[PDB]
């Protein structure tokens, strides 16, 4: 009755999620990234991934033509149409530290940028802390088997949202080059209960 | 007896009244709400209510544990037998949780006041600045109060006479999270029923003073009996009913005022499961049964 | 014998002291004060004369034959004796033509005796000025006859428009507090002088009032035999007084736990409302008991101490008052705010320290307070709380309560009343308590913050209006009750308040200053030998006046960008410009050290917040930083914490106020002076240093590499004196260097 959707997020162009305002200098990282409160390792908050995936799906399944699919997959509480959830996103911790330490390189980078005035032609050097490319983020998404008929459509939509994220970004100044990601190891295995059609749900994500 | 150890893999939001702050533990009504929601999920909410209302599954709330040191909220002793020495002042005021094996040592005096608080370090509260992105409108910045535990640290729940149905519900509660923003990336844990031996002796003990270990409200019959030489503290247990099949909108529930989980009594009372949602189409329940730890001053 | 006459004669009792030290003949001061009062045509009932001219043992022995029983002047004598405590009982009166009385001494600060077991012995004094507060001075000060004559002239001006009436006793206390606060009760050496005349007279009046009420309730008309004909030891041993323990609980949760968009504008209103609640409840109780404001010992910090009469009628009134107040608070603040009322049966020996355990009064008072704070409610109030529960859809935005909800908005009656008042709270404003108002008050009243101009047209002979004012001038006419609290508001918007700096940071800095071990300074800080009701009251009032009044005056001295939320007592909350918080923390520490003579430690905590950060989260984070400052220890060997520290934007960054803070501020000033004018191009190494020194427990190669680079840098500049002083300060002081450098960066950041 409960499904867990495993998989890995691979950073392709470097990602800057979130803003934690503290410990700024004159040079500084003018915008830092979100980290674990204790281990200080960078992470993708489940809210960020959930919201960006919901954005991509909502703008995809509608195209200016939320719907039942988005509301049943991510929830709803608007005024009367209260739908609870089926997806339960989790915070995604940085998996690649054993690999990233073999390169003698930190998990994050400081990207140097500037904006150039168009009237006075004067630059302005901003620094953006960024999680380096090649970082991997193994995640888990819990799906509740509320209805057994709608599972195929829900998982088709989940795979479609992942695919839309593949041709988009996940956090921060994406259109300026940052935040490209990819997905692999995408498998769903039942955690509680027994779903006989777990094979076609793995084939949905495998495709 | 049957310490249920909860190991969290993500920061939790156990909010008390608002989203911007989180507290470090969840109460027993929160856990019963979560288990009742699970039971509605797999269609046996009636048997769960029968079990909990027939005292077959009665539990305390979630207390911290650090490195196999089971903690308990500072019991509300009258401190009538400590003015001779030590520090009968704000020294024993910042102390929030004491270990449960060293309670008789604390009760009789001799536990260090300063040492415990730095010894008691389980993670820290965190800010989580979020937004609601709007395509053309202004974005809506909000923050969620969260709390991350340490590596060998979590919460533990006291349960008497664990049940197969309760074990089935706790398996389902792993994958639906517990706390505030659980459908976001916050509520997440794994549990172990973890029968224990040095703890069951504390609850097989005897004594005049009883320590309430779960936020409980006495029945109307025994309120007078329980409110005699008692050092208690009330707390409002309200908020919004969390269900999509209740009252077709977002409606609050009747605020309930219960004795806190650190209060001490001379008379043992058995609390009640309280109907706090009546105008809706399913019974919204407030688990307020009593869970005690008898001591002798 | 009327009670008002007793109160007036116990208050205006040592006016002869000032009239003797000032001018005129050198006879005994009681006769001089009696003549001074008799010169006025309205203080003519001969009971004032009996109380003033006859309140010492020798006078009573000299007139006991002429004056019959129930002569009302034994009570003031047996009240002065209790107020004095360990001081003289039978001795030569001031100006008795038998001793060269030192008629030039000023009252010293009570911090001379404070913690004399481990902080030495000193004898400081208060110099005379002309408010404002007088700091203790190392130099010995002497009071001039001109000051005495000024006091006499102002007293004669005020007392002309005064009457011996109930409504004018408050004005009498106001005049005494304004004038006598900085003149001694006794003028001699080889003893203690630090007891002010205001505190002495107020305590004497309170004791006399309680004794009179107790005697009237017990039906005694034999004052001479009970008090003066014998040693009054029977009355001393038996219990006659009570001490109330009004304690407001959960003020922090009522004030800071809010989540409004304009919540920052409301904390001042919440604190003002709570202080008004406490003071109005105390005043209403005093009125119910037919007692003057002299009976109040201390109000502030949600904590009131009142000195009552141990009578069955008084206890019944207290029980009914507690029932009514509990019901009202339940109606308004279900459990989010609650006042605990507990009193202890206290005798005369306990206050006068005959038994040597004067502190047992406060010991059992705290025990009863905690007992009532544990079993707060009966098993009917809880039933009412659980039955007055309704399922709602709307709720208050800040208070998040579904009852007392305004019809048109999701805001609670408290939750919009203390927004209307915050909008209407400005300077030169008074506070009125009438049946029509804006903020609810117990006992069917409401309070408003109307201006002084509308006060005249507001009364219209409405019996009791309870005018409350921040400042009092022309004390005699226009009777008002003076209330003090933190009311420095340079600008009440916090946005144009922040955007007044030109070079700096766009962060909101806050301060939480808490005096360390004040409760211990009361439990055992004051010497047991020097234990008196008057001395304890003097210390309490000095601390409260310090906090409220001197915080206001210190901020008003010059242009500070601070919008103080709460001063009260033992605590401090401030919100303002970040650099203003930083540069006023030092001012606060030095002023506290000067006023308390370096006897009491203080701890603070500063946090940086955005323009829309949750103010409840602001307060909670600043509180846990304050705790991190409270639990500071240089070494983990001694018992208990030093508590003398400040946390600077982080709980782990626990700095001090001692030579450590001296070093950090010297470094900050030196860096500010030196690093303003670089080559403006080589300054890019500053962030390099900051991010490579953020923590030194890791690869050290880059640190020594930057050292080598700094050595390599060679041109015509200041040289390498300070360029190597950076290295010299880069090893011994690691956290100090990073903290001073970050403070310098935030101060000098072009933001
Ligand atoms: N006269 C008198 N007043 C008050 N308490 C008194 C007195 N004599 C004996 N005692 C005993 O002291 C403690 C006080 O504990 P508490 O009741 O918690 O009350 C508060 C506060 O009301 C009171 N206070 C604050 N400001 C004043 C002033 N200006 N004057 C008198 N009293 C005042 O002191 C208590 C403040 O608590 P904390 O701030 O937490 O203490 P701390 O110094 O900060 O400790 P730490 O954190 O630094 O370690 C009772 O036992 C009472 O019987
Ligand atoms: N109007 C006010 N505004 C701001 N602070 C106040 C105000 N009144 C009192 N305070 C301070 O807040 C401090 C904490 O008060 P609070 O009652 O909330 O906690 P407490 O002292 O532990 O009492 P209790 O345990 O009964 O709740 C008090 O010591 C007081 O000095
Ligand atoms: Mg209090
Ligand atoms: Mg204090
Ligand atoms: Mg305090």
mmCIF file of N, CA and C and ligand atoms in Angstrom, chain C residues 514 569-571, ligand 5:
data_model
loop_
_atom_site.group_PDB
_atom_site.id
_atom_site.type_symbol
_atom_site.label_atom_id
_atom_site.label_comp_id
_atom_site.label_asym_id
_atom_site.label_seq_id
_atom_site.Cartn_x
_atom_site.Cartn_y
_atom_site.Cartn_z
ATOM 1 N N UNK C 514 20.092 40.871 30.553
ATOM 2 C CA UNK C 514 19.539 40.336 31.790
ATOM 3 C C UNK C 514 20.601 40.408 32.876
ATOM 4 N N UNK C 569 12.127 45.549 34.727
ATOM 5 C CA UNK C 569 13.086 45.218 35.759
ATOM 6 C C UNK C 569 13.815 43.917 35.498
ATOM 7 N N UNK C 570 15.140 43.933 35.647
ATOM 8 C CA UNK C 570 16.041 42.793 35.498
ATOM 9 C C UNK C 570 16.151 42.331 34.050
ATOM 10 N N UNK C 571 15.407 42.928 33.125
ATOM 11 C CA UNK C 571 15.385 42.486 31.740
ATOM 12 C C UNK C 571 15.490 43.694 30.823
HETATM 13 MG MG1 LIG D 5 14.327 38.138 33.982
#
